[PDB]
Design a protein around this nucleic acid. Sequence first.
RNA 1: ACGAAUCUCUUUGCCUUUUGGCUUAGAUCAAGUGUAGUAUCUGUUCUUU
Length: 67
Amino acid sequence: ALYVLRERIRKGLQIYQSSVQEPFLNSSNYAELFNNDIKLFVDDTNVYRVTVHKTFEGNVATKAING
RNA sequence: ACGAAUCUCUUUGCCUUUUGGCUUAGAUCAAGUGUAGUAUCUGUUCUUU
């Protein structure tokens, strides 16, 4: 929590040193994604989907769909 | 032919849906995309009129 806080403040001051301990999932480390180790994977892309429909005024009105 | 009434048009008269403020003209004139919608395009074919 405290690290998050410091990082938050750091972001607030645009001084964020881009330094990570664990490297990202690139195409090479893709192999070592999984390794007899319990994992989970998350995507939030289709949480907020929208029906674009016209209005009386003529402009667009976005309405939420199930996601 | 004169008088009158009815109708149509033309000339004029009437403006009869006929401009309802002020400021520094009140101020400033852009660099966008994909996705969707909407309208508008244009072609495109065929049908029968």
